[PDB]
Short mmCIF file of C-alpha atoms in Angstrom, two decimals:
data_model
loop_
_atom_site.label_atom_id
_atom_site.label_comp_id
_atom_site.label_asym_id
_atom_site.label_seq_id
_atom_site.Cartn_x
_atom_site.Cartn_y
_atom_site.Cartn_z
CA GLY A 1 24.33 -11.60 33.02
CA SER A 2 24.15 -7.94 34.22
CA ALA A 3 26.45 -5.08 33.01
CA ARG A 4 26.51 -1.67 31.16
CA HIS A 5 24.88 -3.05 27.94
CA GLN A 6 21.13 -2.04 28.21
CA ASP A 7 22.18 1.09 26.22
CA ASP A 8 22.73 -1.05 23.03
CA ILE A 9 19.53 -3.12 23.65
CA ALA A 10 17.65 0.18 22.95
CA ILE A 11 19.18 0.24 19.39
CA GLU A 12 18.00 -3.41 18.91
CA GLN A 13 14.40 -2.18 19.61
CA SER A 14 14.41 1.20 17.70
CA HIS A 15 15.15 -0.40 14.27
CA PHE A 16 12.57 -3.16 15.04
CA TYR A 17 9.85 -0.48 15.51
CA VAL A 18 10.73 1.14 12.09
CA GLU A 19 10.24 -2.31 10.45
CA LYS A 20 6.92 -2.79 12.40
CA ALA A 21 5.66 0.63 11.16
CA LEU A 22 6.14 -0.49 7.50
CA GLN A 23 4.66 -3.98 8.23
CA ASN A 24 1.62 -2.20 9.79
CA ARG A 25 0.97 -0.17 6.54
CA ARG A 26 0.56 -3.46 4.57
CA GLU A 27 -1.67 -4.99 7.31
CA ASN A 28 -3.89 -1.83 7.63
CA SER A 29 -4.30 -1.54 3.81
CA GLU A 30 -5.33 -5.22 3.28
CA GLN A 31 -8.16 -4.59 5.84
CA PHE A 32 -9.51 -1.66 3.69
CA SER A 33 -8.89 -3.73 0.48
CA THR A 34 -11.49 -6.29 1.77
CA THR A 35 -14.34 -3.99 3.03
CA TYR A 36 -14.21 -1.87 -0.21
CA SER A 37 -14.06 -5.10 -2.36
CA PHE A 38 -16.89 -7.04 -0.55
CA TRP A 39 -19.62 -4.95 -2.28
CA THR A 40 -21.97 -6.22 -5.06
CA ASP A 41 -21.92 -2.84 -6.88
CA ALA A 42 -18.07 -2.74 -6.65
CA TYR A 43 -17.74 -6.21 -8.31
CA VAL A 44 -20.54 -5.41 -10.88
CA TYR A 45 -19.24 -1.91 -11.93
CA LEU A 46 -15.46 -2.85 -11.88
CA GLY A 47 -15.64 -6.60 -12.89
CA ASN A 48 -14.07 -6.88 -16.41
CA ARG A 49 -15.35 -3.22 -16.93
CA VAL A 50 -14.92 0.46 -15.81
CA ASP A 51 -18.09 2.54 -15.08
CA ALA A 52 -16.52 5.65 -13.41
CA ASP A 53 -19.87 7.57 -13.74
CA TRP A 54 -21.25 5.42 -10.82
CA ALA A 55 -18.07 5.89 -8.73
CA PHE A 56 -18.32 9.73 -9.05
CA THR A 57 -22.17 10.24 -8.91
CA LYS A 58 -22.44 8.19 -5.63
CA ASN A 59 -18.84 9.05 -4.51
CA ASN A 60 -18.52 5.35 -3.36
CA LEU A 61 -15.04 5.14 -5.05
CA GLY A 62 -14.31 8.83 -5.93
CA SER A 63 -11.95 11.65 -4.74
CA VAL A 64 -13.49 11.34 -1.20
CA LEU A 65 -11.16 8.30 -0.56
CA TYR A 66 -8.42 10.89 0.32
CA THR A 67 -10.74 12.39 3.07
CA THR A 68 -12.86 9.39 4.36
CA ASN A 69 -10.11 7.45 6.27
CA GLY A 70 -8.98 5.82 2.94
CA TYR A 71 -5.64 5.59 1.04
CA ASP A 72 -3.41 7.90 -1.10
CA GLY A 73 -4.55 6.45 -4.50
CA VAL A 74 -6.24 3.55 -6.38
CA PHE A 75 -5.85 1.64 -9.67
CA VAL A 76 -7.79 -1.11 -11.56
CA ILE A 77 -5.81 -3.69 -13.61
CA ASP A 78 -6.90 -6.81 -15.53
CA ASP A 79 -5.46 -9.07 -18.33
CA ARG A 80 -2.45 -6.66 -18.92
CA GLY A 81 -4.23 -3.28 -19.12
CA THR A 82 -5.42 -0.34 -16.94
CA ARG A 83 -8.48 1.98 -17.36
CA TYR A 84 -8.88 3.61 -13.87
CA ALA A 85 -6.05 5.53 -12.08
CA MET A 86 -7.04 7.67 -9.04
CA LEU A 87 -3.87 9.71 -8.31
CA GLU A 88 -4.15 11.70 -5.01
CA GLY A 89 -7.98 11.90 -5.48
CA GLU A 90 -7.99 12.88 -9.23
CA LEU A 91 -9.05 11.17 -12.51
CA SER A 92 -5.95 10.99 -14.79
CA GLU A 93 -4.53 8.82 -17.63
CA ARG A 94 -1.45 6.96 -16.24
CA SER A 95 -0.10 3.44 -15.53
CA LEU A 96 0.91 1.83 -12.21
CA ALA A 97 4.05 0.59 -14.05
CA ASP A 98 5.05 4.16 -15.16
CA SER A 99 4.69 6.08 -11.80
CA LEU A 100 7.50 3.88 -10.25
CA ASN A 101 9.05 2.40 -13.50
CA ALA A 102 8.56 -1.25 -12.20
CA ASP A 103 7.09 -4.13 -14.31
CA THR A 104 3.32 -4.98 -14.07
CA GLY A 105 3.82 -8.37 -15.88
CA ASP A 106 4.54 -10.15 -12.52
CA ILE A 107 2.45 -7.91 -10.14
CA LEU A 108 -0.72 -9.02 -12.05
CA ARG A 109 0.30 -12.71 -11.47
CA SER A 110 0.60 -12.39 -7.65
CA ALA A 111 -2.53 -10.14 -7.68
CA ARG A 112 -4.47 -12.94 -9.55
CA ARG A 113 -3.24 -15.35 -6.77
CA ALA A 114 -4.83 -13.10 -4.06
CA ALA A 115 -8.33 -14.39 -5.01
CA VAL A 116 -7.75 -18.20 -4.61
CA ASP A 117 -6.53 -17.68 -0.98
CA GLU A 118 -9.07 -14.90 0.02
CA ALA A 119 -6.09 -12.65 1.04
CA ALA A 120 -4.48 -9.52 -0.52
CA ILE A 121 -0.76 -9.38 -1.57
CA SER A 122 1.81 -6.62 -0.80
CA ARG A 123 5.23 -5.35 -2.06
CA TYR A 124 7.71 -2.41 -1.93
CA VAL A 125 8.06 0.13 -4.85
CA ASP A 126 9.84 3.45 -5.73
CA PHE A 127 7.37 6.26 -6.69
CA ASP A 128 8.47 9.47 -8.52
CA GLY A 129 10.17 11.53 -5.71
CA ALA A 130 9.82 9.20 -2.63
CA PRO A 131 9.38 5.44 -1.73
CA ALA A 132 5.95 3.71 -1.71
CA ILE A 133 4.07 0.42 -1.05
CA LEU A 134 1.80 -1.46 -3.52
CA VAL A 135 -1.04 -3.81 -2.41
CA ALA A 136 -3.44 -5.81 -4.63
CA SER A 137 -6.85 -7.40 -3.85
CA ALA A 138 -9.45 -9.39 -5.82
CA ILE A 139 -13.00 -7.95 -5.97
CA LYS A 140 -15.32 -10.86 -4.93
CA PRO A 141 -19.17 -10.87 -4.69
CA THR A 142 -20.76 -10.40 -1.21
CA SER A 143 -24.39 -11.43 -0.17
CA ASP A 144 -23.44 -15.16 -0.62
CA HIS A 145 -23.61 -14.82 -4.48
CA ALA A 146 -22.13 -17.39 -6.94
CA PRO A 147 -18.30 -17.47 -7.64
CA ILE A 148 -16.55 -15.73 -10.61
CA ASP A 149 -13.74 -16.78 -13.04
CA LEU A 150 -10.66 -15.58 -11.06
CA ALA A 151 -8.28 -15.65 -14.10
CA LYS A 152 -10.62 -13.14 -15.95
CA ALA A 153 -12.01 -11.14 -12.96
CA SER A 154 -10.67 -7.60 -12.18
CA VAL A 155 -8.11 -6.75 -9.45
CA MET A 156 -8.02 -3.47 -7.49
CA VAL A 157 -4.66 -2.07 -6.33
CA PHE A 158 -3.98 0.61 -3.69
CA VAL A 159 -0.80 2.72 -3.48
CA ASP A 160 0.70 4.99 -0.79
CA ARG A 161 3.70 7.29 -1.37
CA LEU A 162 5.56 7.80 1.94
CA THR A 163 5.98 11.59 2.60
CA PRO A 164 7.89 13.67 5.24
CA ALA A 165 4.54 14.62 6.90
CA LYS A 166 3.99 10.87 7.81
CA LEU A 167 7.66 10.23 8.77
CA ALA A 168 6.82 12.03 12.07
CA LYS A 169 4.29 9.22 13.01
CA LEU A 170 6.47 6.38 11.52
CA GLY A 171 8.79 6.95 14.57
CA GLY A 172 7.29 9.48 17.08
CA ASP A 173 3.98 7.56 17.57
CA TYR A 174 5.98 4.25 17.60
CA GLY A 175 8.24 5.63 20.45
CA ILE A 176 11.41 5.95 18.26
CA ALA A 177 13.56 9.14 18.57
CA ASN A 178 13.69 11.91 15.84
CA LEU A 179 12.85 10.15 12.51
CA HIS A 180 13.89 11.14 8.94
CA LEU A 181 14.47 9.71 5.41
CA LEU A 182 18.11 9.22 4.22
CA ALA A 183 17.89 10.50 0.60
CA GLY A 184 21.31 9.97 -1.10
CA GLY A 185 23.92 9.52 1.70
CA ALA A 186 25.62 7.22 4.26
CA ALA A 187 25.30 7.59 8.07
CA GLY A 188 28.43 8.29 10.25
CA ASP A 189 28.33 4.81 11.95
CA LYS A 190 24.81 5.91 13.18
CA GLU A 191 21.71 3.67 13.44
CA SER A 192 19.57 3.28 10.25
CA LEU A 193 17.50 0.71 8.22
CA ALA A 194 17.91 -0.15 4.50
CA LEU A 195 14.42 -0.67 2.97
CA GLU A 196 13.77 -4.03 1.21
CA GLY A 197 13.82 -3.72 -2.64
CA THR A 198 13.97 0.15 -2.81
CA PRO A 199 17.16 2.37 -2.85
CA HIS A 200 15.87 4.61 0.04
CA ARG A 201 16.85 4.17 3.76
CA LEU A 202 15.21 5.15 7.10
CA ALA A 203 17.30 6.88 9.82
CA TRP A 204 16.95 8.29 13.37
CA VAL A 205 18.99 9.70 16.35
CA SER A 206 18.31 7.57 19.48
CA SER A 207 20.55 8.34 22.50
CA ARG A 208 22.29 5.27 24.05
#
């Protein structure tokens, strides 16, 4: 069939790209969550322990993560506790449960399951002021070393708060029209995308 309908096919693609941009965050982060976890010193200095003096003196897991093609922040959780919380490249006392009010009691369970399948796990969350994504990965020994007890091993977690500076690339680099967050409103029969799990919503202004 051929008629004046290709104008609404464009709307079928523009929302699909905004979903792909959020899917791509999870798939880019799991790739960093393996290279920075496949290190003998990372598993030795973070495995059931927290030796931040190494991470700062060598900068291998310090504030430089914000300026070395890394992620917005990092945490270390094991057996229902936390002792390392890199927030925007700073050492601070805080919990990954508190910064988004969500429960850690089930995130540690899926994060434990990341190890037995050699693959990180990913979810949506609601950080203080804007939406975010949470991804968890098991630190496993490289150099063909012996295995470790995965129920008692440590688990690293990376976090990225979405911000209006990155909303420009979440649509403009994906080929979507003008792209903006919908913070506390309802569109006038316009095109938009409700985020899974979080109360926030993505919106844009594509011409038919």
